[PDB]
Paper text:
In addition to the apo-form (I), a protein structure was obtained, which crystallized in β-carotene-containing solution (II), differed from the apo-form, and lacked the electron density for the ligand. However, since the addition of apocarotenoids increased the H/D exchange in H124, these effectors reverse the helix-forming effect of scopoletin and the corresponding H2 amino acids should therefore remain flexible. Consistent with this hypothesis, electron density maps derived from crystals grown with β-carotene failed to resolve the secondary structure between Ile42 and Phe53 (complex II). In all NbUGT72AY1 crystals obtained in solutions with retinol or β-carotene, the amino acid sequence between Ser309 and Asp327 (closing loop) is disordered regardless of whether acceptor and/or donor substrates are present (II, VI-IX). Although all the crystals that formed in the presence of 0.5 mM β-carotene and retinol were clearly different from their (apo)carotenoid-free counterparts (I and V versus II and VI, respectively), the effector molecules were not detectable in the electron density map and are invisible in the 3D structure. This may indicate that the effectors bind in a fuzzy way, possibly through poorly directional hydrophobic interactions, leading to multiple positions and orientations in the crystal that are equally likely, or that the effector occupancy of protein molecules in the crystal is too low. In both cases (β-carotene and retinol docked on II and VII, respectively), a majority of the ligand population occupies the hydrophobic acceptor-binding site in the cleft representing the active site, while a smaller number is bound to nonpolar wells on the surface of the protein. The lowest number of interactions (total edges) was calculated for the protein in the presence of β-carotene (II), while the highest number of bonds was obtained after addition of UDP (IV_A and IV_B), which is consistent with the assumption that the carotenoid promotes protein dynamics, while in the product-inhibited complex the mobility of the protein is hindered. (Apo)carotenoids play a role as placeholders.
Numbering used by the authors: 4 to 42, 53 to 311, 324 to 475
Write the structure that this text describes.
């Protein structure tokens, strides 16, 4: 009898999409019915709605009467999935067949009551790195061990068995201990250890030390005590879009000649930074494609209105400007792309490595500042500015230099060849026999034992 698995998605595409990918992986490879309780580029269940993949909508509660302007995104996203858990309660109460296992998103951990009530096998998804996970867990200890803000720390934080996290590479919920988002994060870290397992969007080669720290380190296993499932790198699969001007232009460009630039669906620069980045791209004398959003200094505008005067005119031959959105996976896969300036968001990161593309780390929010150091210091597949671009403007001199490096210098060629090897490792973990294929089959096992 085919297993029935429910998956729960936090709001947004950066949360919904992974969930979908995950679902498709499972269902394609092992034969499992996938229901999703979500709270020309995609088309969701294209033909996947043959009692195979099925998306039930449940995104219904306002929080306007409970937040303010300064309330941080993490807390907001924690609230949304709380206001009316009852909705979810009754949703699962009205499932004609209860699932044999439920897999909730990182921000839908507060659903334990329900999972316990219907007595279903409950699992959590961590859509980013294991290192960030290890932190999220161990933060329940630091909370006490360190007195004062974490950015004030003179020495790094050393998570048992894991690399040392500097005061500059902290995750955002640790920037302010006097906000609520910190408390939520420690609560999160405490919640993980109640689930029957933890899926993580990574593989062995990429994070061997960290994964084997979570699994085996005594100090961590006195907190964790649950299995861990490195199932990644899970990513959207390259779609087909005949008409896609970006592509049509890229088809005229040489192999690995282009640098792609896009800061993900959350990212937004400030006006000056955008001007310096423009002049940087101009002065580099390198070919590029740039997904530009309106510049928030906290702005619906035409492309000319927010970019430097004559920029588009001058760069007409050297670059392609793309307002708002560009189809990210398809560009990343394309032969003429040999570079990616990114916000270090894990989804995008994964998409880059899986195509063997070197990166320029430009962290902005979330955990991205922590992922940047991991890419650069440890993995050597990315470079970054001298000062993190959150703390200080990155002017056109350092930008120019950083561009020329990645693309045409021999060191640039070393970093690319590194990304390529990590692409292979990804294609080895995912393959029929790899660590992540097998690790999935361990999750399968564990859902049948329950």
């Amino acid at each position: 009898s085919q297993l029935h698995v429910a998956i729960v998605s936090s709001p947004g595409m950066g949360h919904l999409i992974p969930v979908l990918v995950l679902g498709n992986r499972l269902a394609t490879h092992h034969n499992i019915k996938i229901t999703i309780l979500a709270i020309f580029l995609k088309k969701t269940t294209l033909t996947n709605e043959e009692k195979t993949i099925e998306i039930i909508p449940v995104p219904s509660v306002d929080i306007s009467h409970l937040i303010n302007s300064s309330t941080k995104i993490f807390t907001q996203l924690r609230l949304l999935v709380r206001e009316a858990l009852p909705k979810i309660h009754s949703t699962i109460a009205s499932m004609t067949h209860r699932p044999d296992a439920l897999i909730v998103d990182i921000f839908c951990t507060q659903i334990l009551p329900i999972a316990e009530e219907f007595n279903i096998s409950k699992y959590t998804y961590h859509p980013t790195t294991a290192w960030t996970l290890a932190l999220a867990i161990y933060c329940q200890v630091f909370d006490k061990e360190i007195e004062g803000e974490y950015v004030e720390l003179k020495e790094p934080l050393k998570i048992p068995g894991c690399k040392a996290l500097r005061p500059d590479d902290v995750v955002d919920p640790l920037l302010d201990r006097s906000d609520q988002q910190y408390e939520e994060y420690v609560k999160l870290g405490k919640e993980y250890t109640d689930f029957d397992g933890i899926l993580i969007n990574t593989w062995e080669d990429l994070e061997p030390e960290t994964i084997n720290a979570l699994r085996y380190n005594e100090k961590l296993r006195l907190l964790l005590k649950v299995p861990v499932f490195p199932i990644g790198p899970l990513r959207r699969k390259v779609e087909t879009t005949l008409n896609d001007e970006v592509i049509q232009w890229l088809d005229k460009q040489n192999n690995e000649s282009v640098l792609f630039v896009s800061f993900g669906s959350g990212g937004t620069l400030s006006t000056k930074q955008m001007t310096e980045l423009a002049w940087g791209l101009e002065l580099s004398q390198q070919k590029f494609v740039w997904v530009v959003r309106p510049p928030s200094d906290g702005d619906t505008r035409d492309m000319s209105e927010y970019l430097p005067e004559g920029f588009l005119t001058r760069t007409k031959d050297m670059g392609l400007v793309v307002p708002m959105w560009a189809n990210q996976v398809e560009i990343l896969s394309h032969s003429s792309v040999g570079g990616f300036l990114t916000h270090c968001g894990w989804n995008s990161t994964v998409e880059s490595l899986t195509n063997g593309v070197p990166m320029i780390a430009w962290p902005l929010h979330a955990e991205q500042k922590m992922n940047a150091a991991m890419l650069t210091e440890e993995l050597g597949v990315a470079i970054r500015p001298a000062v993190l671009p959150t703390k200080k403007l990155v002017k056109r001199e350092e930008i120019q230099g950083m561009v020329r490096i990645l693309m045409q210098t021999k060191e640039g060629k070393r970093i690319k060849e590194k990304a390529k090897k990590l692409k292979k490792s990804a294609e080895n973990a995912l393959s029929d026999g790899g660590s992540s294929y097998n690790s999935i089959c361990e999750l399968v096992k564990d859902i049948r034992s329950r």
